[PDB]
Design a protein around this ligand. Sequence first.
Ligand SMILES: [Zn+2]
Length: 255
Amino acid sequence: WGYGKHNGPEHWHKDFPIAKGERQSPVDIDTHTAKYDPSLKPLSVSYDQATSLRILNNGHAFNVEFDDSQDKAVLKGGPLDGTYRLIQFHFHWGSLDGQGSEHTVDKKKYAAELHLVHWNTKYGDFGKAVQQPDGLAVLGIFLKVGSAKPGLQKVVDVLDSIKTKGKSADFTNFDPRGLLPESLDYWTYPGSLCTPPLLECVTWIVLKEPISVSSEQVLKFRKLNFNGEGEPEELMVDNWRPAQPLKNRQIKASF
Ligand SMILES: [Zn+2]
């Protein structure tokens, strides 16, 4: 599986049948159909103690991994019950500024999308979490092209170092707080992982407010390779999955 013409999202169902299930992700967020739910508590983002470890090119995206052996970077509140630990974050972007996000708002596409992945600490580890309906909580943040994001620059500069699939670089003392928008208003719905195995274990929390990044920040993203070193160069772009059918599910807003 990949994002190519022969291994793309349109093909995943062949190896991953769940691909055509009932609670697949990403989806189009219809703002006029979303239900304001007064019973939704505010989100609680505690990342003051975050411990980043490294960044790696997995051939489909770049992942920034965190030490999740203790409650150091956690998420709670909102529609969540219990504590969820930050394990990693990655992005999805396009070849152009007009595409790249997974989730869409009123059919509008953003330049990129950030996914913060967290797993429910009653399950003991990530692996057992993906087997539960309330196993993971992914925080989704949209990216628009405008003014640079100071907090993203540490990431940008390291990209050179993990150009091809399989490369990794030590990446400590990175503070994820530098990626958050001013407002914490969100949308939430039950969904799945954004890539194979496509497990339907995710509570999606998508922030209404996007962060801005400069054109040269995103450009650096697009310089990445899906291919491993010593192979034909295939630029890592359009690594995003198209919107899936809501299929009954209801999207709730905190505003
Ligand atoms: Zn993702």
